[PDB]
Amino acid sequence: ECILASLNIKSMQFDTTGVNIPIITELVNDTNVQFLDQDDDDDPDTELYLTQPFACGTAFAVSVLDSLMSATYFNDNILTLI
Amino acid sequence: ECILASLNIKSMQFDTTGVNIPIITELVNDTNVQFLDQDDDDDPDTELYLTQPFACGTAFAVSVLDSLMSATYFNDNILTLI
Amino acid sequence: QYHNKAHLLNIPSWNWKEGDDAICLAELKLGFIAQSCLAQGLSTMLANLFSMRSFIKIEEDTWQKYYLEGVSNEMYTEYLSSAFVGLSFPTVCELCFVKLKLLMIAIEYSRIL
Amino acid sequence: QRMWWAFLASSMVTFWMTSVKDWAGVMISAQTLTGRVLVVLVFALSIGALVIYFIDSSNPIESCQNFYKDFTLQIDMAFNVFFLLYFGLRFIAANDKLWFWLEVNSVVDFFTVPPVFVSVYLNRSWLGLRFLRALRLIQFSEILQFLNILKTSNSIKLVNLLSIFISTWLTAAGFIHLVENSGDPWENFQNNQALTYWECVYLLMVTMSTVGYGDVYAKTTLGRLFMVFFILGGLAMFASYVPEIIELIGNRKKYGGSYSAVSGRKHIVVCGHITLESVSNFLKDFLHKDRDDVNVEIVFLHNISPNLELEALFKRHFTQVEFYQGSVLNPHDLARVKIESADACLILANKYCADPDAEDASNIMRVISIKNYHPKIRIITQML
Amino acid sequence: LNILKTSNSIKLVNLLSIFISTWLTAAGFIHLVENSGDPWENFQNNQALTYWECVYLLMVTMSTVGYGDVYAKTTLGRLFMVFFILGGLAMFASYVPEIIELIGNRKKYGGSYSAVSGR
């Protein structure tokens, strides 16, 4: 449903198309990132942090935030900065 | 239920018998055609389009719609015409 | 289902004008039945115009030979000759039938009439 | 002596267009009866060529060409000519040349007939090396299908696997016998053992069946060095191949076939839900001794295969009941059970189903099918 | 003929009876054919084998052990022993014995109770 919604808002027609409309999304399966964009070399081998959606900032995932424990065991960043 | 209803409609009498009402029946198993009519040369080997009910037009199935994929691949405007 | 053709149409790279056509089983089936409600036999007549069948002869003088000669026919799309421009559609219909035993049913006008 | 170089040089070292080609030699298309009988001819000819077997091996050792023999060698000479013209037609239909020299059939032919060419151009024929020709025999399933003896899908794979098992076993035995009669070349065959073609076959059997009697052994060094790898490989192949033969032994359609009518005695048909308690309740009240007339044959009918103790029930009730497999809605099946002379046709209906109406519609379906087939038999059906 | 009914009786009837019958009939046939001698070789290599050693040799042939103490010294006898190997390890290894592993073990605590008086 989320992928279809993103494709639909990109495919909307205006009197001027929906492909330039700013949008971010949310995903739960990091292997599903490839369907979001079509003018790309969608390859399953590449890691999530390198694909075009994340690179442009038009995607997100909860699974990225699992490095917080490792990055906070050595510092104090979560207490103030975030 | 479909064969039973068709048999009941074709058998039940009136004030005029009950063999003049028109019935079109939807079917999912093509081998079940032989139960819909009583005067025919029953043969499970015979295909649908050579059978008396399908020739009379008092039967239909979704299996005969597979040909439309090949037809519409070969001719582009066939589906639009239909 | 007929409530998913819209979802399919919503895909950005879908151009049904180009020729990407989606067959909806329920739509075509119920349309065949409903149009047969207007005229009995139209359902089987339309269903037998797509099964690419060849002509078979039956010498028993029963209805098998006649119905098989019927099912032997099929349909195609083909551009027609340039000699028929200023004339009328009924005129080309009757001329085509009486000359080469070909009958039209529709023409492209974009629009199909 | 030991001029193995002539065979080696002829085989190892050497490694009107369509007037008759597509007219006769049709393998892939399989169009003409000429090609059909051509494949039949090559199969029967390979069989006859291999027919020499141990009665050839038991006869005295290889020597020069003789005049009178038990069987004329000129028939085998014409067999070699036949194989050579086959190789020529395959070469002119080679398509890809490199794949033609690569393919197994061409390489085995180029291994087998140039020895016969050596026999042609010199009267020093060798009896050995001319028995491992089962590669052609590996496939008689095509012959069986062309002769319509067997056509079911449950026997083709079984016959293929059996054929390749037998062929691999025979060619392994043949190569072992060659090794036995060879001896060590670097030792000038001074350690060779003398054994006929018989014993090698049963030695391969007792190795495959992991028995190993040991009455006679692999004395030859390279023979032993081949049995080590053969034990490594053939056992693995065997253990890989049982899992797709066990079911074909088991899934074989039991209680099939037609029915043989016996005149002067009637028979009834029972179709529907049949299970141990129901058939027991029917039998113990139908075949009771106080009811004198029990001389009817209670033929059964169902779609699923019988299991549990129904088979034993029918076994102890040998002369009174039968069984068959197939649904009742098929007119061919109904003709097979031969109800055209049936006195009646009972029906058993399930009474424990969750939905009573579905089973009752099913019973109506059975009745309409049966009455459509034969419109005058007597039916005694149940209801819910 | 009035044997105690536990269905272990019918199990042994349908397994051990047929197994024993096949074993001794195979032993008797191999004894007769081995002592008969070579038919077309003027009966020269007729070994002095009797029933006890025939039974032991048949059991060694069965299972998997490869004892070379006694063996078939004739071609026909050896080939027919190959036929028994095939028949045995097909039928009495994939038709009958699955029942014997399906039997498993008897009841665990299927005893009874005797009311010792006073308690």
Dig out the tokens for D327 from the structure: 């649904």
B65-82 burial, b if ≥16 CB within 10 A, otherwise e? Answer: bebbeebbeeeeebbeee
Q: Which amino acid belongs to residue C112?
A: I
Of B24, B71, B81, the CB nearest to C112: B81
Of the candidates C32, C38, D360, C5, which has an alpha carbon nearest to the alpha carbon of residue B26? C32
How long, in residues, is chain C? Answer: 113
Contact D302, D325 (CB under 8 A): yes
Q: Is D96 left (phi over 0), alpha (psi -120 to 50) or beta?
A: beta
Contact D204, D213 (CB under 8 A): no
Q: Is D193 left (phi over 0), alpha (psi -120 to 50) or beta?
A: beta
Q: Which amino acid belongs to residue D39?
A: V
Q: Say whether B44 and D331 touch across the interface (CB within 8 A).
A: yes
- Determination approach: cryo-EM
Rounded to a whole number of angstroms, the distance between the first and last alpha carbons of chain B is 31
Residues in B touching D328 (Cβ below 8 Å): none
* φ/ψ of residue D219, rounded to 5: -65, -40
Contact B44, B28 (CB under 8 A): no
Written as one string, the DSSP assignment of D286-326 is HS-TTS----EEEEEEBSSPP-TTHHHHHHHSTTTB---BS
> What CA–CA distance (Å, rounded) separates D38 from D24?
8
Sign of CA pseudo-dihedral A18, A20, A25, A28: positive
Residues in D touching B7 (Cβ below 8 Å): 368
> How far out from the chain centre does Cα D173 lie?
21
Answer yes or no: is A15 a known binding residue.
Answer: no
The CA–CA distances, whole Å, from D201 to D206, E82, E88 equal 9, 10, 19
Contact D353, D359 (CB under 8 A): yes
Sign of CA pseudo-dihedral A15, A19, A24, A26: positive
Q: Say whether C12 and A7 touch across the interface (CB within 8 A).
A: yes
Q: How close is the nearest chain D Cα to the Cα of B20, in Å?
A: 21
- Write the DSSP symbol of residue A19: G
C15 interface with A at CB cutoff 8 Å:
no
Written as one string, the DSSP assignment of D119-146 is HHHSS---STT-S--HHHHT--HHHHHH
3-state SS assignment for residue C10: coil
Answer yes or no: is D297 a known binding residue.
Answer: yes
Residues in C touching A20 (Cβ below 8 Å): none
Dig out the tokens for D308 from the structure: 């549990």
User: Which resolution in angstroms does this entry have?
Assistant: 3.8
Q: Which of E65, E78, E83 to mutate to test the interface with D (most CBs of D within 10 A)?
A: E78
Physical contact, A and B (3 or more Cβ pairs within 8 A): no
> What CA–CA distance (Å, rounded) separates E57 from E29?
13
Q: Say whether B68 and C50 touch across the interface (CB within 8 A).
A: yes
Answer yes or no: is A30 a known binding residue.
Answer: no
Sign of CA pseudo-dihedral D109, D114, D117, D118: negative
